[PDB]
RNA sequence: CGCCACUUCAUGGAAAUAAAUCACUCACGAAU
């Protein structure tokens, strides 16, 4: 045929920046470029260069020499135009008792981008107010105008249509075989690696698809882990409960991998930190040296516990042995490169901001190499090998002291900055082996084998089933 | 002034987009590299963009009514999300932040967003087999192109008209009659004035409850995944905007796989060696239905491979 | 609008002086696209937007497309050098200062038609002069 | 649970191509 019609189901909400339009749905401007790469990769049996030669032979490319684009047209349209609108934040907040029927909240999520939308600011969607009752509860108010003028919204739609048109019949038949696997292997949105934007193919040309998502994930990803998540659901019922539990679990488990968990009597060390201590180079946190250097200038950092220095039941030291020094590197860069670190000085209006900028100006960003997939309320953690380019690269840290001005007769006045407070920094320490430099050896499969086989008190911290290791 | 475009209270949208866009204000400074990235420049361009995107169009507009009176009954279709882009290659760029970096096709006199008739003609011809020129460079892709497009056109003609069989030579003759008003060899058929197929400029006719223009983003992430992507902001026609397609189409007569004029076909009818087997007719209504089906299949405008410019029935 | 041979001589000398056409009598092939795009930008967007776009130096382009603005400046200076005394009464026969931003000059000198015709003619002359030579 | 953000804002290709380039009639007539 020349037209391929498919119906897509949505498992997790998508974070759309063009939520204002009633016709807003999955943008083909990011589905077609990704689908073209997927099809070429599968055409070359795991490689992309032989796949484009296959499409070059079959005359499936728009340009035979320049790009990966295939000659087909993509059109994603909403069938029924009713949406469920979600507010996705990282901080828990009380729920207002006045909302539109389609307004839902995901409380503890890995989406730390619209955190200012809940709080004191008059531009916030939910205004937090101290309770007129006992000063323990907090009151929430829904500001409709502020809701409308939000940049990103979480949108979930009823089943909609993806239409592919091409006069090349042989291309369409190949697209048909790979389209179901494409939606099982990819997520869309502004936080898609964390689980937002999970879609699956249900009907292709009015024919139901029987695609094993577990088998589909196995072929395309090097490792696949599945979580035994309890459902309760009362009895099905609340998807908001299911959504909130699933996304809270993802944030908890990911934050156990990168950095740790510090809330209660409970404390879980960074498994990424744990991995690098157990290997031969014995790298330690770059956070360790920042904390050491900031303490060197007598900055009272908040916390009653000295920084950890190893793996054992407790290694709470402020000093690094004596004969040699601990080997340092930028550990958490390979699992997502951040922009700045905050360290919460003692006086509760000032804090230390350390800024990472990359010395050569060659590494601006790094997407997380870990993909979280939520298909039918089941969390699948997949991934491939990390980008080896990030390994062994320099980073410059700018240590900045920030003190929040003690309010004003107006609003907060955080322009009271401070010049880069003086620190004894390193330049090329230990033959370019220092906390400036990313590690020179990392395998994601090896790391994830260590992570899901890691036990505290005889139980796995990340309760996952190793579908593929 | 801000909404309900009209002829008495409006600014020319094309003027606003092209000449007044980079007006030199007392304190803006987008000449310098520092000022191109500043918040003052971003605010300036944000205000200009808000002015451009604040206009709506009423169905009972004297402008569109005059278009209907001049060019005939419009073919009315609706834009679906993401919208419609036309004139994307027109140079509108300086290197500033918050600026529209893609061109837009604006009518000069009226300022209304419009799709030129040449764009419509080319988009309709593209799905006819004999649209790719026989060249040395195009010789390798010519046969498959013609085969695919001829099967598509044959199915469309059988669906729209009451023609049961159409031949490849008949499709060639029909396409050359519609788009060139000539024989496939290049010869001319003595046609009357009313026997010319004309593709007028499409116009925006109704915005309904919203505006007819909006802003959209394309963020090309580079080949290097470790480097920051560049956001590009451009102007689009909003979804659910009525587009009036104006045509002047005639009836095409086909006798013995050649295209005949009206007096020619009547003379042939009066002949005693006349058979209905080799006489074929596609009327202006059927031609308009065929064009409508082509437009609903492939859409119109720029970036149609990624969903921009797809149309729906009212 | 006829391009005199003197304007084309100015264009060739300016293109050589601004290190676009090397001693091999070849030029980077992207510069013909640069000149055509500038010609189109002047007529669609305007003189100020086009010169601002083509004059900045922090662009992510293959070559130094800001050199076509220097070529324009040289051609306009050469044209103004041959303005007669009678022209100098109506026409601003003053050399563009050099090291001065061309956009700044045009902004400060109003937006007179004189500069628009001069830049249009100079761009056409640059286009023809580049067509005199061969792509690298 | 409390608190809190930074970053990125256009490059590459196409810049005219082909058909028609004058055709027909009168090329001196009448008187001288």
mmCIF file of N, CA, C and O in Angstrom, chain B residues 2-45:
data_model
loop_
_atom_site.group_PDB
_atom_site.id
_atom_site.type_symbol
_atom_site.label_atom_id
_atom_site.label_comp_id
_atom_site.label_asym_id
_atom_site.label_seq_id
_atom_site.Cartn_x
_atom_site.Cartn_y
_atom_site.Cartn_z
ATOM 1 N N UNK B 2 -5.912 45.390 17.866
ATOM 2 C CA UNK B 2 -5.092 44.189 18.076
ATOM 3 C C UNK B 2 -5.681 42.940 17.439
ATOM 4 O O UNK B 2 -4.940 42.092 16.930
ATOM 5 N N UNK B 3 -7.005 42.819 17.448
ATOM 6 C CA UNK B 3 -7.699 41.656 16.917
ATOM 7 C C UNK B 3 -8.679 42.111 15.846
ATOM 8 O O UNK B 3 -8.906 43.308 15.655
ATOM 9 N N UNK B 4 -9.267 41.141 15.140
ATOM 10 C CA UNK B 4 -10.230 41.418 14.073
ATOM 11 C C UNK B 4 -9.592 42.286 12.983
ATOM 12 O O UNK B 4 -9.852 43.484 12.861
ATOM 13 N N UNK B 5 -8.712 41.630 12.220
ATOM 14 C CA UNK B 5 -7.803 42.275 11.278
ATOM 15 C C UNK B 5 -8.438 43.438 10.514
ATOM 16 O O UNK B 5 -8.038 44.589 10.699
ATOM 17 N N UNK B 6 -9.457 43.159 9.697
ATOM 18 C CA UNK B 6 -10.230 44.139 8.920
ATOM 19 C C UNK B 6 -9.385 45.131 8.113
ATOM 20 O O UNK B 6 -8.154 45.135 8.188
ATOM 21 N N UNK B 7 -10.045 45.951 7.296
ATOM 22 C CA UNK B 7 -9.356 46.910 6.441
ATOM 23 C C UNK B 7 -9.252 48.300 7.051
ATOM 24 O O UNK B 7 -8.437 49.101 6.588
ATOM 25 N N UNK B 8 -10.062 48.612 8.058
ATOM 26 C CA UNK B 8 -10.078 49.939 8.655
ATOM 27 C C UNK B 8 -9.131 50.090 9.833
ATOM 28 O O UNK B 8 -8.641 51.196 10.077
ATOM 29 N N UNK B 9 -8.863 49.016 10.574
ATOM 30 C CA UNK B 9 -8.012 49.073 11.765
ATOM 31 C C UNK B 9 -7.104 47.845 11.756
ATOM 32 O O UNK B 9 -7.468 46.792 12.285
ATOM 33 N N UNK B 10 -5.922 47.989 11.164
ATOM 34 C CA UNK B 10 -4.951 46.903 11.131
ATOM 35 C C UNK B 10 -3.599 47.455 10.722
ATOM 36 O O UNK B 10 -3.494 48.553 10.174
ATOM 37 N N UNK B 11 -2.567 46.670 10.992
ATOM 38 C CA UNK B 11 -1.255 46.862 10.397
ATOM 39 C C UNK B 11 -1.013 45.733 9.410
ATOM 40 O O UNK B 11 -1.403 44.589 9.661
ATOM 41 N N UNK B 12 -0.398 46.058 8.278
ATOM 42 C CA UNK B 12 -0.093 45.037 7.287
ATOM 43 C C UNK B 12 0.799 43.975 7.912
ATOM 44 O O UNK B 12 1.880 44.282 8.421
ATOM 45 N N UNK B 13 0.329 42.727 7.897
ATOM 46 C CA UNK B 13 1.081 41.653 8.534
ATOM 47 C C UNK B 13 2.430 41.450 7.862
ATOM 48 O O UNK B 13 3.435 41.198 8.535
ATOM 49 N N UNK B 14 2.474 41.559 6.534
ATOM 50 C CA UNK B 14 3.746 41.469 5.841
ATOM 51 C C UNK B 14 4.671 42.619 6.181
ATOM 52 O O UNK B 14 5.877 42.427 6.360
ATOM 53 N N UNK B 15 4.122 43.831 6.270
ATOM 54 C CA UNK B 15 4.917 44.978 6.689
ATOM 55 C C UNK B 15 5.469 44.765 8.091
ATOM 56 O O UNK B 15 6.673 44.921 8.324
ATOM 57 N N UNK B 16 4.610 44.340 9.019
ATOM 58 C CA UNK B 16 5.049 44.070 10.384
ATOM 59 C C UNK B 16 6.144 43.013 10.414
ATOM 60 O O UNK B 16 7.099 43.121 11.191
ATOM 61 N N UNK B 17 6.026 41.985 9.574
ATOM 62 C CA UNK B 17 6.976 40.879 9.614
ATOM 63 C C UNK B 17 8.314 41.245 8.982
ATOM 64 O O UNK B 17 9.364 40.806 9.462
ATOM 65 N N UNK B 18 8.309 42.040 7.916
ATOM 66 C CA UNK B 18 9.524 42.248 7.141
ATOM 67 C C UNK B 18 10.150 43.622 7.324
ATOM 68 O O UNK B 18 11.366 43.713 7.510
ATOM 69 N N UNK B 19 9.372 44.703 7.281
ATOM 70 C CA UNK B 19 9.998 46.017 7.337
ATOM 71 C C UNK B 19 10.034 46.595 8.745
ATOM 72 O O UNK B 19 11.059 47.146 9.158
ATOM 73 N N UNK B 20 8.942 46.480 9.495
ATOM 74 C CA UNK B 20 8.883 47.033 10.841
ATOM 75 C C UNK B 20 9.493 46.123 11.895
ATOM 76 O O UNK B 20 9.646 46.552 13.042
ATOM 77 N N UNK B 21 9.836 44.884 11.541
ATOM 78 C CA UNK B 21 10.344 43.945 12.536
ATOM 79 C C UNK B 21 11.626 44.459 13.179
ATOM 80 O O UNK B 21 11.719 44.569 14.406
ATOM 81 N N UNK B 22 12.620 44.794 12.365
ATOM 82 C CA UNK B 22 13.894 45.298 12.874
ATOM 83 C C UNK B 22 13.938 46.822 12.802
ATOM 84 O O UNK B 22 14.832 47.423 12.213
ATOM 85 N N UNK B 23 12.944 47.448 13.422
ATOM 86 C CA UNK B 23 12.940 48.894 13.552
ATOM 87 C C UNK B 23 13.912 49.305 14.648
ATOM 88 O O UNK B 23 14.049 48.624 15.668
ATOM 89 N N UNK B 24 14.618 50.405 14.416
ATOM 90 C CA UNK B 24 15.668 50.828 15.332
ATOM 91 C C UNK B 24 15.051 51.691 16.421
ATOM 92 O O UNK B 24 14.725 52.860 16.195
ATOM 93 N N UNK B 25 14.882 51.114 17.587
ATOM 94 C CA UNK B 25 14.318 51.776 18.747
ATOM 95 C C UNK B 25 15.415 52.489 19.524
ATOM 96 O O UNK B 25 16.598 52.169 19.376
ATOM 97 N N UNK B 26 15.059 53.480 20.349
ATOM 98 C CA UNK B 26 16.105 54.264 21.026
ATOM 99 C C UNK B 26 17.067 53.435 21.857
ATOM 100 O O UNK B 26 18.262 53.752 21.897
ATOM 101 N N UNK B 27 16.596 52.373 22.526
ATOM 102 C CA UNK B 27 17.485 51.526 23.327
ATOM 103 C C UNK B 27 17.159 50.055 23.052
ATOM 104 O O UNK B 27 16.395 49.422 23.783
ATOM 105 N N UNK B 28 17.750 49.498 21.995
ATOM 106 C CA UNK B 28 17.578 48.074 21.721
ATOM 107 C C UNK B 28 18.919 47.375 21.480
ATOM 108 O O UNK B 28 19.218 46.371 22.136
ATOM 109 N N UNK B 29 19.738 47.891 20.559
ATOM 110 C CA UNK B 29 21.114 47.431 20.354
ATOM 111 C C UNK B 29 21.183 45.928 20.057
ATOM 112 O O UNK B 29 21.644 45.132 20.871
ATOM 113 N N UNK B 30 20.685 45.539 18.884
ATOM 114 C CA UNK B 30 20.997 44.199 18.401
ATOM 115 C C UNK B 30 22.110 44.195 17.360
ATOM 116 O O UNK B 30 22.322 43.176 16.698
ATOM 117 N N UNK B 31 22.832 45.307 17.207
ATOM 118 C CA UNK B 31 24.001 45.325 16.333
ATOM 119 C C UNK B 31 25.141 44.518 16.945
ATOM 120 O O UNK B 31 25.778 43.700 16.273
ATOM 121 N N UNK B 32 25.417 44.741 18.225
ATOM 122 C CA UNK B 32 26.561 44.129 18.878
ATOM 123 C C UNK B 32 26.264 42.683 19.260
ATOM 124 O O UNK B 32 25.111 42.270 19.398
ATOM 125 N N UNK B 33 27.336 41.908 19.428
ATOM 126 C CA UNK B 33 27.185 40.525 19.865
ATOM 127 C C UNK B 33 26.572 40.454 21.256
ATOM 128 O O UNK B 33 25.720 39.599 21.526
ATOM 129 N N UNK B 34 26.993 41.346 22.153
ATOM 130 C CA UNK B 34 26.425 41.373 23.494
ATOM 131 C C UNK B 34 24.940 41.707 23.458
ATOM 132 O O UNK B 34 24.140 41.096 24.176
ATOM 133 N N UNK B 35 24.551 42.671 22.621
ATOM 134 C CA UNK B 35 23.162 43.079 22.560
ATOM 135 C C UNK B 35 22.245 42.112 21.848
ATOM 136 O O UNK B 35 21.036 42.129 22.095
ATOM 137 N N UNK B 36 22.787 41.272 20.966
ATOM 138 C CA UNK B 36 21.973 40.256 20.310
ATOM 139 C C UNK B 36 21.447 39.222 21.294
ATOM 140 O O UNK B 36 20.395 38.622 21.046
ATOM 141 N N UNK B 37 22.153 39.000 22.396
ATOM 142 C CA UNK B 37 21.796 37.993 23.380
ATOM 143 C C UNK B 37 21.097 38.576 24.599
ATOM 144 O O UNK B 37 20.724 37.821 25.501
ATOM 145 N N UNK B 38 20.910 39.890 24.649
ATOM 146 C CA UNK B 38 20.440 40.555 25.852
ATOM 147 C C UNK B 38 18.946 40.318 26.067
ATOM 148 O O UNK B 38 18.218 39.877 25.176
ATOM 149 N N UNK B 39 18.495 40.618 27.285
ATOM 150 C CA UNK B 39 17.075 40.515 27.596
ATOM 151 C C UNK B 39 16.278 41.655 26.980
ATOM 152 O O UNK B 39 15.084 41.494 26.714
ATOM 153 N N UNK B 40 16.906 42.811 26.760
ATOM 154 C CA UNK B 40 16.211 43.913 26.103
ATOM 155 C C UNK B 40 15.848 43.557 24.668
ATOM 156 O O UNK B 40 14.731 43.833 24.213
ATOM 157 N N UNK B 41 16.778 42.932 23.942
ATOM 158 C CA UNK B 41 16.490 42.496 22.580
ATOM 159 C C UNK B 41 15.408 41.423 22.563
ATOM 160 O O UNK B 41 14.515 41.440 21.705
ATOM 161 N N UNK B 42 15.479 40.479 23.503
ATOM 162 C CA UNK B 42 14.467 39.433 23.583
ATOM 163 C C UNK B 42 13.093 40.020 23.878
ATOM 164 O O UNK B 42 12.095 39.595 23.293
ATOM 165 N N UNK B 43 13.024 40.999 24.782
ATOM 166 C CA UNK B 43 11.753 41.651 25.081
ATOM 167 C C UNK B 43 11.220 42.410 23.874
ATOM 168 O O UNK B 43 10.017 42.368 23.590
ATOM 169 N N UNK B 44 12.098 43.117 23.160
ATOM 170 C CA UNK B 44 11.691 43.822 21.949
ATOM 171 C C UNK B 44 11.070 42.865 20.940
ATOM 172 O O UNK B 44 9.970 43.105 20.417
ATOM 173 N N UNK B 45 11.760 41.759 20.669
ATOM 174 C CA UNK B 45 11.251 40.820 19.679
ATOM 175 C C UNK B 45 10.015 40.090 20.183
ATOM 176 O O UNK B 45 9.143 39.740 19.387
#
